[PDB]
Amino acid sequence: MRECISIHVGQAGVQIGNACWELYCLEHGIQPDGQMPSDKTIGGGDDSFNTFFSETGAGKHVPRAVFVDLEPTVIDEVRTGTYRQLFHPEQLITGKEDAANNYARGHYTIGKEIIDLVLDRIRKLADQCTGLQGFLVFHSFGGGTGSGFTSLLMERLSVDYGKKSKLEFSIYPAPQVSTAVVEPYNSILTTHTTLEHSDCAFMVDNEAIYDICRRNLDIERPTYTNLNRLISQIVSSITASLRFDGALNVDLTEFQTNLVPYPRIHFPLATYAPVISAEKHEQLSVAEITNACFEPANQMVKCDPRHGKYMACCLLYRGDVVPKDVNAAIATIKTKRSIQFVDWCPTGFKVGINYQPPTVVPGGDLAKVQRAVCMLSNTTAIAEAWARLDHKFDLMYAKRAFVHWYVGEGMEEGEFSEAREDMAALEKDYEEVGVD
Amino acid sequence: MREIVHIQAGQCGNQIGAKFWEVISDEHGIDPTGSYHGDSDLQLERINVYYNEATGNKYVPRAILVDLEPGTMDSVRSGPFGQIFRPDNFVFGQSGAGNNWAKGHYTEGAELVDSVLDVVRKESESCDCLQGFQLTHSLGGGTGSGMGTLLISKIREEYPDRIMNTFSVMPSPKVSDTVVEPYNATLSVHQLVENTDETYCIDNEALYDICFRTLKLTTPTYGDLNHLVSATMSGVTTCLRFPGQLNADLRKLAVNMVPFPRLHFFMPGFAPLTSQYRALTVPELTQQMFDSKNMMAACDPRHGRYLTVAAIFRGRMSMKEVDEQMLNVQNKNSSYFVEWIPNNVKTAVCDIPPRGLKMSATFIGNSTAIQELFKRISEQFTAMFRRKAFLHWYTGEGMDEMEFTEAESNMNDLVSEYQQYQD
Amino acid sequence: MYTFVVRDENSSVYAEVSRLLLATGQWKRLRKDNPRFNLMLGERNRLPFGRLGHEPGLVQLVNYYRGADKLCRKASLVKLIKTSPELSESCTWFPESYVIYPTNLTDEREVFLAAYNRRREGREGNVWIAKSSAGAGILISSEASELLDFIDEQVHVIQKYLEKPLLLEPGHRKFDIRSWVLVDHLYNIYLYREGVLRTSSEPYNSADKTCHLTNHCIQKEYSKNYGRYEEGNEMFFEEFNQYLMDALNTTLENSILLQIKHIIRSCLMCIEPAISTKHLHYQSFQLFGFDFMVDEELKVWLIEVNGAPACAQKLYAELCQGIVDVAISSVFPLASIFIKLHHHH
Amino acid sequence: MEVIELNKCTSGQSFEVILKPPSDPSLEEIQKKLEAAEERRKYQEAELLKHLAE
């Protein structure tokens, strides 16, 4: 058994992390006070769920997580929340004044004064791990802390844990729920400095999650709570192999091996199905949910894979699914869908099935389903998200709009063009792989 | 608790500031004695932003009252909410400023500024996390204009890493006290350009027109004008005084609203403005919110372009419909929003409406059309300065004609800076 | 009050469409860089499809189908027909074609020569034609050596030249048929009722490319009989149908138009899965120009498909109005000249 | 077409289906950048105080 440490940075990271660990406890039968009745090995054990939970002598299962935010308001919710008993206070790190949606403020000015404290707390959880695989980092692109401080943390982690893998869960900015105009700046800045330090990053576009909540859950004006519930389901499907017995994606290294042949192109596209309103149902079959994995309306990032190429593809099923039905659905899909792989990669799918059906928070918006699937595909079409982000960056930076806020924090104007040039190179790489 | 320190200076600043504290005290359920008698926890959730808590569960406004004359502050102390202010926070002289910027900034104000800074230091020392300062004042007088900008300069020196915000009343010949107001306003504006992060430009010409043309007040008074300012000030600070996600603090507001450091002068708007029990639909609020007749700067928005816009909706209403209407306004009038700042319009909704209204909307716009306001002041300034008229009032306080020439050039530069971004 | 932007100033078809939209008083044109638009008349090359459908509260429509270039490129069309089971290499309405890459750069040089030798040995007609997508440069020869050497001198394509074309009388001249097809956001296939025949003004000689190429520009530049028979070497369906009845005792519908409609459906239905915007965050429509060849046996052959075609002068007003009616107003209603080719989605 | 590496356990099973064969900076450097940014802030603030002193 090898442990994983979860790091949640900023409001988006903390709130999403709070929803994920709530889902983890429900899936593993862990009560809010930390007691796990099904865990017969009291105070220890090397079970699959122990990769995410440590055990005390009193039987409490403590998540291997660190919560960091430059403002105390959001983390104070966890301190007095339903699962406040899970985390000891050392895991919750809060500042006083946040990054004010300013990458430079979160990276240089305020991050410099708290970076050592965060690492020391991380070191405490690392000392409890017999073998540490790496870290899972949750953050937003647009926030000052989520962008600026995450990039600083990623650099230090590569220094102190050079042999450990690092995976990202990143929230792509969407104007419908955005809180700052400079989010395109922070997104590109944090991507530039984190690109070499991340082995695999799962981007979630708030626009896609927002529309899925409206379209499929009949939510008129989705809130962060609605968005995070859906996001935690996708995250749970992705990390389920690390927490349950299985043979696919059993460790963080396998994610890079199965999804990332080219290190820079490490942004797999996530597609989830089915999303069913609890207020509403005809249960969908294996073929129907598998076919929905190729509908853009169900993707975490709105893009068209038909006009890109695939480098890898994993199917993660939860519920009543047998391999025979998966293969039959795949055969039909190939005869109706435009699925183009790169010539230097096999045209196939890695399939993982967990018999336990997806867990839903009681009283939530997602209805219980007999079977669900999350598809992780490394498609060049996801570069459309970079193109949108880069265009907005170009519009503002041409006039130097808002640049003085970053320069005032000690950042140099050249870093803007340095980061933009890196994004331009990244866009070029995607076009070479996916376009003839 | 991200505290804000409030300062009101001069006759106009204290009269408007007093009404403002009266308005927000009612919203937060604070009586004139400082006791809380509300019925919702949203009122007290961010009460610490503007109020200190004392013994006996009392709430004392974090406000400092400044004037070179005692008359107006004596009225405030004897006013409705006079007893709620901290007695030691009344800092006043006796000489006065004579509607003279030099007296407030150089001679009379200089003698009193240090004692004001002592009160500011005392208030700041007891802050867990100080956001910055907000100042209410007029630019046409001597104390608010002259001593107010001197206070800003010295506050910035002692607190360089804090946000400086002002509600600044712009003089107008329509509602005027002395002919030297263009002189005082021009001198103050340069100070604001350098030493403030956010300035809400409130034009007495616009306030009078709204009272006369819209509210149907044939003989508006200063009290009537201050009614609009109180309501506008309450609306613009709504995101600061109640839980929310957008523009919840001074620095985040500045980051969203100020693409260039010197272009930080905002046009405020309020809706509805009724001369009264009729319910107002969300589409009606949005149209009136963006209507020039509801603006407080007496500038035509169609004469320029919006760099950034902050919208605040208050009351119980369909947030889905609010998003639709806001998107409709931008899409139907996209030509008036600069395309090089994508998604430059941010909308916030607060459940608690203002007193007497089921719902309301507050508009904060950073428009290049504000240059019309500075052009008007510059023309009035030059009309007198070219003949050196009334300069002796200022040269008698030690000022030189060169300082007036520099102020004239600085404001013309500010007008030119707005012009380049409007094309 | 809908909004639209113009990003292709050289489009004669959509210049009229833009003019008609403004004439309705309900469409407002924006700057070409303004993102808050309902309709985009995008540019031909590198249209930013990835930035469409991401504007909240805006239904966005564009006048091109992403991925349609597979059907509107010389090399792409040949590859699509051979590799698509819906069309197969045994396609009967498409001339035998081969994609040949220049030697200075898969390729089908050896495959092309294998079929060429069979015709030479079999005494059959062995005349081929070479062309590319970078031309105004077309070579017609009966010797394979000249064709290959010419290409080496961009990617070209070689296909069998129809040595027995249908020749109009009087004149003994060659011609080609242009059909305009509109595909809306629902992927309905609308065929404009009015077609044109770009005829050659010189007698056909099977033993000079003036009488072999039906290009309007070539006929108006290298032909000395331009406009002799019909105005601008353009014969419309009304006249051509009358000629078929008088000369061959048949109608345009039965002899030719049925095959044309069949070919249009086969091509568009083949690529429907790859380009449909049925479940996409933005919607697409596009106007296509199909060029057909008719042999002496009244058999219709497909030459190429144009993604950005121009319309006949007399037909500009009617066709552009139809575009606004069924393609733009269908998605943005305001305050038939087409034939619907029904199919299975 | 081909199913390979079929692994079965109590909680589920996994496999692979193939349809077609194929055809860092050091801590010293990090601190230098952080300290360089902090120094630029001090220089900018010092100039402001110099301007206010005048």
Ligand SMILES: Nc1nc2c(ncn2[C@@H]2O[C@H](COP(=O)(O)OP(=O)(O)OP(=O)(O)O)[C@@H](O)[C@H]2O)c(=O)[nH]1
């Ligand atoms: N999906 C989701 N997105 C969120 C959530 N909270 C914030 N965001 C997004 O994150 C972006 C803003 O970043 P934040 O995380 O709020 O900022 P921060 O990391 O706390 O950094 P600061 O500037 O110091 O506040 C916006 O685009 C929001 O849409 C959340 O709970 N769920």
Ligand SMILES: Nc1ncnc2c1ncn2[C@@H]1O[C@H](COP(=O)(O)OP(=O)(O)CP(=O)(O)O)[C@@H](O)[C@H]1O
């Ligand atoms: N295989 C073939 N058999 C007979 N004639 C052919 C032919 N290929 C081309 N042609 C002749 O050459 C002409 C021009 O060919 P092509 O369609 O490639 O030119 P182009 O691309 O310049 C026309 P447009 O762009 O206007 O559709 C045709 O109109 C036809 O007369």
Ligand SMILES: Nc1nc2c(ncn2[C@@H]2O[C@H](COP(=O)(O)OP(=O)(O)O)[C@@H](O)[C@H]2O)c(=O)[nH]1
């Ligand atoms: N809106 C408003 N404006 C005022 C009020 N009192 C004065 N003014 C304006 O302020 C300017 C005079 O400044 P004033 O505050 O009286 O001078 P000070 O006391 O020395 O700061 C003139 O342009 C007046 O129009 C008031 O109560 N409300």
Ligand SMILES: [Ca+2]
């Ligand atoms: Ca155990």
Ligand SMILES: [Ca+2]
């Ligand atoms: Ca590494």
Ligand SMILES: [Ca+2]
């Ligand atoms: Ca004195």
Ligand SMILES: [Mg+2]
């Ligand atoms: Mg935050």
Ligand SMILES: [Mg+2]
């Ligand atoms: Mg006065």
Ligand SMILES: [Mg+2]
């Ligand atoms: Mg052509």
